[PDB]
């Protein structure tokens, strides 16, 4: 079949949680370390951890590596099920709330700075709690170092290695498929980031790291070759610049603007490729943009949607 010729919405349901490589992780502690913002931190006690991102990533990952049970707090990116019932200490998007931080009492926050403010890092931090700031790469062909460098954190390299192996192992794998189910003519996409009917309506560049998973789906991430760097506004000038064939949105962000209904009434929207074909692929917000250990089964499934009637 031509995926030219496929119409509206395909949407990825949740992969859940991250399946760990151990059932009986035993954190070798104490750990000291440089942080990415340079930072001397010593981790003595991982017992309460909060791992917070805009991503989704940390929380998967430190499940991945045995210490699901040690998460006392998420930020609201952290939607897989195993946490469902944890408090949350972010508000709005992603703005920390340092009061909800420190009433957990953690013991060790392995944070980065894709969510502020860091004024309130900084304020836990001086408070007493370990604080470890990380700079992940955020690349399909690193998602094996930003495991490893996350096992360092917590005294389980043994497990990262098993964790960083197999993810890319899967991650590879998915290519394989990908590939075979791609059109000689790859499809123009965009990540359109939506959160309400309202103006929080973007598409997503280099800063967010859609571009990897556009190009792991076999695409062309249009925000990539219009050189868009952080995000630009998705108006109706944009939308017609970049043209897309699909748009790659988040599932519960796409039900926000009203779904694709509420999506087709967006000035510009309509008028390309993608809203012409009513084009949208909707993947679990959580997932979306996390990479990480479940890569490889996001990538089969969205290509299978993508490219399978
Ligand atoms: C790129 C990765 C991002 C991810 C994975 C992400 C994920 C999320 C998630 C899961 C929620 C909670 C949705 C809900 O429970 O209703 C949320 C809310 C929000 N996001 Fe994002 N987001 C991202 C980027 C952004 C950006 C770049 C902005 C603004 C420039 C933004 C603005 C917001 C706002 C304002 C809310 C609050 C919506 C509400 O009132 O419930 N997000 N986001």
């Given at each position: 079949?031509?995926?030219?010729?496929?119409?509206?919405?395909?949407?990825?349901?949740?992969?859940?949680?991250?399946?760990?490589?151990?059932?009986?992780?035993?954190?070798?502690?104490?750990?000291?370390?440089?942080?990415?913002?340079?930072?001397?931190?010593?981790?003595?006690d991982v017992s309460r951890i909060?791992?917070?991102?805009?991503?989704?990533?940390?929380?998967?990952?430190?499940?991945?590596?045995?210490?699901?049970?040690?998460?006392?707090?998420?930020?609201?990116?952290?939607?897989?099920?195993?946490?469902?019932?944890?408090?949350?200490?972010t508000t709005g998007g992603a703005?920390?709330?340092?009061?909800?931080?420190?009433?957990?009492?953690?013991?060790?926050?392995?944070?980065?700075?894709?969510?502020?403010?860091?004024?309130?890092?900084?304020?836990?931090?001086?408070?007493?709690?370990?604080?470890?700031?990380?700079?992940?790469?955020?690349?399909?062909?690193?998602?094996?170092?930003?495991?490893?460098?996350?096992?360092?954190?917590?005294?389980?390299?043994?497990?990262?290695?098993?964790?960083?192996?197999?993810?890319?192992?899967?991650?590879?794998?998915?290519?394989?498929?990908?590939?075979?189910?791609?059109?000689?003519?790859?499809?123009?996409?965009?990540?359109?980031?939506?959160?309400?009917?309202?103006?929080?309506?973007?598409?997503?560049?280099?800063?967010?790291?859609?571009?990897?998973?556009?190009?792991?789906?076999?695409?062309?991430?249009?925000?990539?070759?219009?050189?868009?760097?952080?995000?630009?506004?998705?108006?109706?000038?944009?939308?017609?610049?970049?043209?897309?064939?699909?748009?790659?949105?988040?599932?519960?962000?796409?039900?926000?603007?009203?779904?694709?209904?509420?999506?087709?009434?967006?000035?510009?929207?309509?008028?390309?490729?993608?809203?012409?074909?009513?084009?949208?692929?909707?993947?679990?917000?959580?997932?979306?943009?996390?990479?990480?250990?479940?890569?490889?089964?996001?990538?089969?499934?969205?290509?299978?949607?993508?490219?399978?009637?």
């Amino acid at each position: 079949t031509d995926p030219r010729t496929f119409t509206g919405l395909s949407i990825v349901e949740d992969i859940g949680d991250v399946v760990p490589v151990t059932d009986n992780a035993s954190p070798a502690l104490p750990v000291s370390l440089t942080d990415a913002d340079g930072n001397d931190v010593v981790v003595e006690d991982v017992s309460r951890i909060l791992p917070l991102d805009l991503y989704g990533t940390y929380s998967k990952t430190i499940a991945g590596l045995g210490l699901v049970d040690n998460i006392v707090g998420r930020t609201v990116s952290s939607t897989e099920p195993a946490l469902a019932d944890t408090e949350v200490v972010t508000t709005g998007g992603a703005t920390l709330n340092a009061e909800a931080i420190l009433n957990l009492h953690p013991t060790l926050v392995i944070i980065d700075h894709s969510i502020g403010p860091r004024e309130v890092i900084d304020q836990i931090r001086a408070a007493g709690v370990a604080t470890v700031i990380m700079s992940p790469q955020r690349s399909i062909a690193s998602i094996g170092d930003d495991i490893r460098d996350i096992a360092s954190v917590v005294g389980l390299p043994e497990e990262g290695e098993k964790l960083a192996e197999r993810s890319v192992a899967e991650v590879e794998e998915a290519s394989t498929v990908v590939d075979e189910l791609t059109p000689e003519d790859p499809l123009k996409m965009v990540f359109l980031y939506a959160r309400g009917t309202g103006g929080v309506f973007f598409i997503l560049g280099d800063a967010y790291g859609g571009r990897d998973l556009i190009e792991g789906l076999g695409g062309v991430d249009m925000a990539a070759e219009k050189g868009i760097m952080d995000l630009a506004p998705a108006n109706a000038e944009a939308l017609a610049e970049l043209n897309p064939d699909v748009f790659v949105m988040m599932s519960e962000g796409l039900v926000s603007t009203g779904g694709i209904d509420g999506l087709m009434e967006r000035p510009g929207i309509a008028q390309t490729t993608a809203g012409q074909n009513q084009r949208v692929l909707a993947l679990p917000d959580g997932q979306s943009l996390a990479f990480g250990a479940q890569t490889g089964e996001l990538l089969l499934r969205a290509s299978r949607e993508l490219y399978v009637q």
